[PDB]
């Protein structure tokens, strides 16, 4: 029961934004100020 965040590139979902952002930056070359388009917040039980 938490809100996870997936990268809109690989579809990879993380349980924390830290894992999300570091992956957005690392693989999808997305800078943290531009993450809003490449990450989506979804709540899962
Ligand atoms: Zn990705």
41 CA distance to ligand 1 centroid (A)?
14
The DSSP bridge pattern shows strands 13-14 and 2-7 to be antiparallel
| Experiment used for this model | NMR
Tokens of 9: 């590139």
CA of 39 to the centre of ligand 1 (A): 9
Ligand 1 ion local residues (Cβ < 5 A): 7, 9-10, 12, 27-28
Rounded to the nearest angstrom, the distance between the alpha carbon of 5 and the centre of ligand 1 is 11
For residues 35 and 24, the answer to whether their CB atoms sit within 8 Å is: yes
Question: Could you tell me the distance, in angstroms and rounded to a whole number, from the CA of residue 17 to the centre of ligand 1?
Answer: 13
Which backbone phi and psi does 25 adopt, to 5 degrees?
-65, -50
Q: What is the dihedral of CA 20, 21, 25, 27, to 10 degrees?
A: 0
* Dihedral angle, C-alpha 2, 24, 10, 36, nearest 10 °: 70
Query: Do the beta carbons of residue 23 and residue 12 sit within 8 Å?
Result: yes
Contact 40, 24 (CB under 8 A): no
Domain map of the chain by residue range?
Answer: 1-45
**Maximum CA extent, the chain:** 30
- Give the CATH number of domain 1-45: 3.30.160.60
DSSP the chain: -EEEEEETTT--EESSHHHHHHHHHHTS---TTSGGGTEEEEEE-
């Amino acid at each position: 029961m938490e809100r996870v965040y997936q990268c809109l590139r690989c579809g990879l979902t993380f349980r924390t934004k830290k894992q999300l952002i570091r992956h957005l930056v690392n693989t999808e070359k997305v800078n943290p100020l531009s993450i809003d388009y490449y990450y989506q917040s979804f709540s899962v039980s």
